[PDB]
């Protein structure tokens, strides 16, 4: 016994385990500043790192299967391609994604030296991140 009584009890428990549901995780949780200001640090680099890859795999594909691309050759195709009202919807949303990732990467270089990790310091370095983003992102439009 105790091995015949462990197989027999795991047969009816592995049968009941397969019909249990999962409790909801998103869509019920409270919106806080700890996981809303941290999902803007993964979104902002995926949307920016894709543009960095696509513009360097284009110059490195046209080297092998040679078409002869140049920086002033693609700049006319992008400038002349979009109307005026969508030229500023693209560049108006890359200025604020650059300021929230530049000012959020200094927030993480402090947190690997184990400083500013109390609850009083997680919130006061996150109120500077919303002030640094709204000023640097608007100054980059005037350039």
């Amino acid at each position: 016994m105790n091995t015949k009584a462990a197989i027999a009890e795991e047969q009816i428990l592995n049968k009941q385990r397969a019909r249990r549901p999962i409790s909801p995780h998103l869509t019920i949780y409270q919106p806080q500043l700890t996981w809303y200001l941290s999902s803007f640090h993964r979104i902002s680099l995926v949307l920016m790192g894709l543009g960095f890859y696509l513009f360097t795999i284009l110059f490195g594909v046209s080297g092998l299967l040679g078409l002869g691309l140049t920086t002033e050759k693609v700049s006319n195709w992008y400038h002349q391609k979009f109307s005026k009202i969508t030229e500023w919807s693209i560049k108006g949303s890359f200025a604020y994604l650059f300021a929230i990732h530049y000012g959020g990467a200094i927030r993480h270089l402090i947190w690997d030296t184990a400083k500013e990790l109390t609850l009083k310091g997680v919130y006061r370095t996150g109120y500077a991140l919303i002030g640094f983003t709204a000023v640097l992102g608007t100054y980059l439009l005037t350039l």
Binding site: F59, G60, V61, S62, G63, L64, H79, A105, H108, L109
Partner: protein, 131 residues
């Protein structure tokens, strides 16, 4: 993507069993933590000396910015594969997603070279694109 058959209910056994931890593989553990902190410590000062520059950078200061931007972007795409496409639930397609982060980032380094030697820089492409 085809999904491997999972454990029934998420668990298997009695509470007096134990989790058997993986062997020590510190090329994926502690040494990977070193590489993610060298690329971040050298893209924050180098981008700050690009908002204070009159025009484009020199080809000694622009190649060192572009190679340190590719490794910084590789190490975060590496960390989204291992959170969402895992070997527990997909199996073979955890490694096939890590080989297409191979020649989709080895052609990228060839694209850095054909920007730096004929045209001027990566920063000389985005400054002329505008923002």
């Amino acid at each position: 993507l085809p999904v491997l058959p999972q454990k029934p209910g998420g668990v298997r056994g009695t509470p007096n069993d134990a989790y058997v931890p993986p062997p020590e593989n510190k090329l994926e553990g502690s040494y990977h933590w070193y590489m993610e902190k060298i690329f971040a410590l050298s893209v924050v000062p180098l981008a700050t000396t690009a908002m204070l520059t009159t025009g484009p950078l020199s080809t000694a200061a622009d190649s060192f910015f572009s190679v340190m931007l590719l490794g910084y972007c590789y190490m975060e795409f590496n960390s989204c594969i291992t959170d969402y496409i895992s070997g527990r639930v997909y199996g073979v397609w955890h490694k096939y997603a890590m080989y297409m982060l191979g020649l989709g980032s080895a052609v990228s380094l060839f694209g850095i070279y054909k920007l730096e030697t004929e045209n001027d820089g990566v920063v000389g492409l985005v400054k002329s694109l505008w923002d």
